[model samples]
Target: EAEAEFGACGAIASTVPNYNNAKLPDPFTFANGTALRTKADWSCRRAEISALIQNYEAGTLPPKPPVVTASFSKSGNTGTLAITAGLSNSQTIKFSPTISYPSGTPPANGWPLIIAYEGGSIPIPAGVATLTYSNSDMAQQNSASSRGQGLFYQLYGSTHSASAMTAWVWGVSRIIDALEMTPTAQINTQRIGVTGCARDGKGALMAGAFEERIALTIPQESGSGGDACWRLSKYEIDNGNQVQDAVEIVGENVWFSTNFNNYVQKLPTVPEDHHLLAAMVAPRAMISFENTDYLWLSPMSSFGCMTAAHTVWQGLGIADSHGFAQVGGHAHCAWPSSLTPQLNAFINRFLLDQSATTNVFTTNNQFGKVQWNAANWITWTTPTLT
Candidate 1:
């Protein structure tokens, strides 16, 4: 019944750990998948956002670029490295068009410019570690603050709603501009990969779907409004009517279309979810994560979503290049030391076209895969109580 409602698009199989070796169906084999609409309406909306990015790049946007701690000299490699190091800790919050770059340059040899966005940069976490005030204050004050909640806050003010994913994409393009001018830059400008956790994950997905320039995109633990099958009745984000739940989260609305507000209790009725979103890009590679730490984000649901999304990639004939994860717990910011090298390696392969120098799937004979199971994976006919 639920499949009838959400359609078979939501019933796609999960990409299990042994999926590579398993007799799993092709990744892109799902016919009832989500389809991106690029007709008259969406195209116009896309153009508006694109124009906004251009204006922002030209310093015509209301908020200007953040103050640079050090001057970046276009001619000096030392200055470029200094700028990159500084940005390592900063977020591109303010809209500054002066930073925009053409989309074809390659990336630096070792340090590829990765734009990582987090969900709800609302009250925002003190940092990437603890959720406590003291810890968060330090994170809030970091240079990258603008890249997270602070970014949404500074641009839109007190209202914690997801806004201008395209604007953030624009911010990324501007940074690409800076990268292109660097002497030692080996950047694959076309290989810019945008990654987001939770709501930021939604932003990254949206950015990739709308912008063809983004080579790959990943939305880790981006439930419901992101990679999770939004049509699933098991986990539903209340439509706009549930103000309190969404109010606490700043970028809530940014995850869905205004039309999405009508489906709080009617997820199965919606024709789309994260899988279709994944199909829109057909990126060279796409990565997603599942965390057991944050249950509100629903690990099982995310896992199921990844499974379904894999089918979309498979349909596009890019299944081998796709990635998914089922991790331990809900801590979104805990950058696993083990996974960092894997991520770097993936970036090198897709963005740099280098051979896979590191193996992230297994270490010491223990295979690394995103955790998922039948219990976490939902079935058709799951009832909605709302």
Candidate 2:
């Protein structure tokens, strides 16, 4: 019934009136008569995709438990980073080893638990910096090279069905299972987030779309199979027959829905595009990232998609709540030194109740400033001073 009430307002405008008071920067307005908005009652708003979760019921209020836990091991560092940084410093963070959702009647306090997923077993770029490469770097490279990596290793699924992306998404749900079992978790069970880079990025989006409990989603350079527009996507091949290209889709089955087969060889003819998929997130934010030189993704195309996606958010009138971050280039460097601070700032501003002031640094000579015309991503933000 709540879904009936919410209609197809999309994600941002639907919830803008409720969360505008959140401790973040003012909405970023578009010259084209567009602006961002927050929901006045985020917890009360019914999400569109909650139907996928077994325990979920329609029109229910958000769960209110003290702690929310997800599956986080030594492996899921990015998910760990989001949870840790997103939670209040006063909040307690812990680990859940097992995975499974709760059965029967739901708890009153809600679900605070979220699971973390490590994309897959692709080697991170060899670490030249320290003896061991950072886990983030490893995750990044592993994700970047998943197709080649998977093929080289013969892990590509030639049978039964689910591909790498789907497998990764399934892994995220397993983490959700672990969250349901945590005693301290505040099970807004519907509000968990799924995130990953490159291949894992595809997993996060595919998982969030596939599983309703996954309320929020952040996909970083998930390229063609994940988020990049197949037609406009730069690096990966987007032959009209992509989905049916057994080789491509089968290899990345984890990322696609069973229904995706219908679109193979008919991308443009298919009514829905990635924006429609994004709108399916309803009340939650889908923060997308575009790397300038990510060979697999096209920055221009990604930017164009963001522009189109804004309309979906705009019609819902919650533009401010959703976002797109376009960094300088395609290097696939671990984390762009140029972009991390902006990301950190965004995390604090949106997830944490913080605000940021903008400073335009014209020269490299100035601390926190980029050298003029540096081949950086579109724009980079400076971190806040202590």
Candidate 3:
């Protein structure tokens, strides 16, 4: 009966055309029906969206530990971070991340850093150093049963409801904390970026969304939960497209919390989607690189979802800060030569603080056929952000 209901709502897996014109919740509207009219109003909306995501999707993110501190060894570019949640000294956790300096003399403050998950599969620019984030050490990525095995779980225990992605984000923030404390770390704590591929890409997106310190968020080929909107992906699944949706993705990995299971089948009940999550990074720079040929990646959904997110940047009068480049023909996570110019533009403009034009928004594949009907999904008008 649940399956029947899910199918009726255009969420179940099918081989027929199931493009349901389901309405996405308005990002600018509060649950109380209060519409956001000014830039200041978005703060409340953003908070509401954040609460909704924590309650339904990501789970309860704990506040920062009271006694968070770090010690860095300049010789190896290594650091030991410690976090204590409660008054008891026993309630503590520790982890280390290795930082790499860019070639040539560092900036007066320090070189810009990119927090790369699992040592980063993507190529880093010449001047930017990479901070190899040990995400799995902070929170294991295996099954839900593997939750309590990581450093985060050691502090919060297994019953802690936050997802693996949330733990990873917290860990990244701590690394930034260390960078800020240690000048010899040779990292400009403010000009930080984060990137990951596939599953790690999902983690990277969550990291950027929750952490305000990230200057650039580059989630490469982050399909399904990463960059694709839940509603759009579900529609694709219902249409019989071989793509991952909330239903299929939840069972595959423990990226999301157990709280997500109850709402994945009833996606409309969830107040926000990935676009809103992407919007949380608005006014900051975000570039989504999606693979157009991968069915599971849901390239069309990424393009549409991020486009919706672009409205937030546009509202802020920084439309060029957000870019979405969907290019196919290359394999997943493989850097396409075509995107080099735009990628360089972003690196130069954001990381290096150089004068580079970043007017990028394009889909190199068969976009006309795959692009979402904007009239169908977008219901609210973009307000002029102050």
Candidate 4:
């Protein structure tokens, strides 16, 4: 019955021919078959989904260090911030971020900050500061062979379950820790966002999911592992399109754990997909900026997958908290003037604490045709989460 259901949904594809229309596992459902009917119930289910993703995809993230300390020094608009974390002498990790505040006088609470991965490509609004987070310094991504060549590996060792993405997330969290500790840093830790393009965008997504302190999460043209789903991208690939799927992505980059290697060609066994990963941010604000002109980025998959993720925000009664915008005719990673309004809307609303409408889910193509059959996939109804 499962096979027939999958077959009928046009699931068989080049990457995983056995892949089917089986609904991506319900995020609000429990392991013992209990349905999540309230906000409280969803909390338990969210934890379960997070654990499953960590175990099977991203690997296990280490607990907080026993000792976390920070120090900051400022010279006008430029500042130097250092962070140290360790349980003891033998197991210590540290990083220093060079901070740049805006040129003009900052907001009363200090300038709103955006943590950029790999120095970012997104256009920043005036008065908002940019913290160029050196993600590669936290965890290198040369290949699976480069696993242990990072600070995260220095502490957890080479064979730790955590993926480079997870380590990058940890690194960003430590940056937040420093901002919170430094009174003269002149940045509002509460009004922070994270963004990166392509592979770095995937890291931004992971950082946003694992860290709740970020007010806004934006992943731009992140292709397969970032915002696109394994099943959907595979289906597109099966149709003889040029989109990148799990089969192509895992071997190409070390963005995911080696644990994910076991399930790339066998996606059905995996309990979650990118939609659930987006849901890990819950009612937190996220905007998926994609490029429809780039087929390899799987713009269609990002639109559908993030739209499915928006259902979670809808259930939480904050549908406006999440948005999706895809534009073509521009080069990859180039911020289009067309999307500036939507981007500013989220920035003003989430970072500046200003009143702005965030109802912005639009795609340049007829991408909804690529989505899973709702009747087959959406078995559980959304509850009015309080």
Candidate 5:
């Protein structure tokens, strides 16, 4: 199988460096130990991280199809996106995620929308439409046995290695493709967002990390794979905290590439962690709404992980563009009223293109004041870009 080219960082390191520490990998450091120096460096680094996710954890992300065809009827409120992808042997996969309109007229560019994973979370603010992306249509996460059992495998073949999360991300890009061609649908493809909770939240983060088209990304209570780093999550269990970790997460579902099985026993060797995953959406509007009450979700790790990831935006001089909010007193995947303001802040700033403050970073729900900090974990300095 032909491998995709990683960016300026080049291919995944020829040697998988041995790392035994519990600290998250520095996002500014490339696989080859090159420091990310400028905004363009971040762009190239993003591709390197994407390649790491694809090769080691998520399998390969197929390129855009040679043909992307779409059509929609406003009366029907649904459309089909057909992707004919491959080099020599190709297959056309078609999908239609239901789209719901807002109450009235759209803005000049058309109404903004959210690619709702498993129906999404948070309050879909007025004027923002909801496009339900049933991830099952692309990749099913019923169980580990459910691997290679979705539209993704149908197109790429059952032998393909891409995980459910990567495939779901692929579905998102295709949906964007459909939206672009279906202009009559009156969707402002530019003002798009992605959200989900629990299992769906993991997919939401993955989509946001990989899809630059998304304006705002909100992932709710997305445990291990969503916001918590493998090293940090393992640290949670080390201190006698019962939380989800790589070994358990990989065995539980088809969300990761089978190649990931090789590194679960040696997590530190994987080069990138979930913090880098969250950081991939940096400089973009993203608010990870976490629930502090869940032990399995590793709230402490979420704080440590995202706190580190936030520096990327800080370094880029747009900390306000990214946010981190974790609040307890709510059930898993349950929406809390406390987060509505922050959610509105991001929606207003990004999706609606309105003036609104988005500098939100907290763990105030703070169910546990675990000792996860920069002193013990992160070692890199947040560069102050001029």
Candidate 6:
């Protein structure tokens, strides 16, 4: 029903037509040039953005399977999820995602689950259980040549449209389905969080943006194709700065849609940017972590894009829900203990439903010299979406 409603935006080519802009596209504005005014407007607008992402960025995402079932063993702390879809064309794919519970007993209802894309991140708090989902089995991100391969392609077909990240997000929903079906798993479906670093981090961000069921999304050093905007990243590359851009990313892996190659030259024409992609996760808690020292990851792009992206939460009356940290002086995917406290704030508030301060904006302002700012790119004013 909701899918049909979001379909109000219709096809990408017909709706967007042609859009050429250097600055990040307005998150509050619809593809049809309609300004999204109220909190309710975001519903279809989000759906619209989702379609744009699927059509231009990732390939079309197939609907949830008809039957999703799972089995769990408390002794082993592991489980097998079986996805049964495609009626006329039938096939059942079975896989296992490693799940480990905290020491001692459960929390009555269930333990909060963290679905890590590659593996795990930031020392999973005792209050939360870690579900290590190695996405390589779902869709291969190992190399640029690894297209139309993995379990997702098996279900949807090798020539299916969805990218590796898109397929991974679908896999995430199935994992949730498995969790929801297996009550014996003792996992809190509502308290689910997703995290990953680097390429996996890119997938994690897309999962959060696409899946509304997710509670908190932690994207670590995700860089260009993840949190950083194409325009801003392009700005970095254009200005003699070494940063990853759309052209470079397209040549790398299958993290994005196969059709994404079409807009590599028409970047300005790509209606949606990473700012809107990150904005699509609004009203939900998400804290992006960046490696400031990694120029390829583009700390400047993360700062500028997220700074604009944070306004969506502000307009929705949840300014504290979104946080951005540009911590430099570290290697890629490096976790410094200094970010532990801030990271915990999100974990406590969203995943545990505890009363903790969440409006955090940590950065290495004094550490590095950044050229981008809010005024440089973000021209759209934050509105009260009440």
lDDT of 3: 0.78
Clashes of each: 37, 59, 0, 0, 0, 0
Better of 5 and 6 by lDDT: 6
Error of 5 at 3 (Å): 18
Task: Tell me the TM-score of each prediction against the true structure.
Answer: 0.52, 0.49, 0.90, 0.90, 0.93, 0.94
| All-Cα superposition RMSD per candidate | 13.5, 14.4, 7.8, 7.0, 2.9, 2.5
**Candidate number of the best TM-score:** 6
Ranking by TM-score: 6, 5, 4, 3, 1, 2
* Better by lDDT, candidate 5 or 3: 5
- The collision pairs in model 4 are none
Give the lDDT of residue 71 in candidate 3.
68
Instruction: By lDDT, rank the candidates, best first.
Output: 6, 5, 4, 3, 1, 2
lDDT of each: 0.42, 0.39, 0.78, 0.80, 0.82, 0.83
Tens digit of lDDT per residue, candidate 5, span 1-386?
A: 11356443446452345645556788887777778788777877777788777767888887776766776655554433333334345576777677888766678999899989978867898778898888987998999989899987888888788899999998898888778877777889989999998899999999999999999999988989888888888877877788889989999999999989998888877778888888889767788988878888988888888988888999998889888888888887778888888999889989988899988998864535356667888899988754
The local distance difference test score of model 5 is 0.82
Q: Which prediction has the highest lDDT against the true structure?
A: 6
Cα miss at 29, model 1 (Å)?
A: 11
Off by over 4 Å in 2: 1-116, 119-164, 184-191, 210-215, 234-254, 257-262, 355-386
lDDT of 2 by residue, 4-122 (tens): 56644333221111222111111123112233234422222223222211111111112222434443433322122122101233433232233233334434655233333453221
Candidate 5 residues lying further than 4 Å off, grouped into runs, are: 1-21, 76-90, 365-369
> lDDT of candidate 2?
0.39
**Candidate 1 stretches greater than 4 Å from native:** 1-94, 97-112, 118-163, 170-187, 233-254, 357-386
lDDT of 1 by residue, 1-386 (tens): 15586553333322222222111122222223323232322233233333322221111222223433222433322223222212333543332211212234323443333444532221211111111111111113222223234343443342422234534543454455555555344444555666766556666666566556666566665654566544332422332111112222323333322223444444343334455555455535766655555545554445556666554444444565677655663256556654555565566676666786532322121112233443443333211111
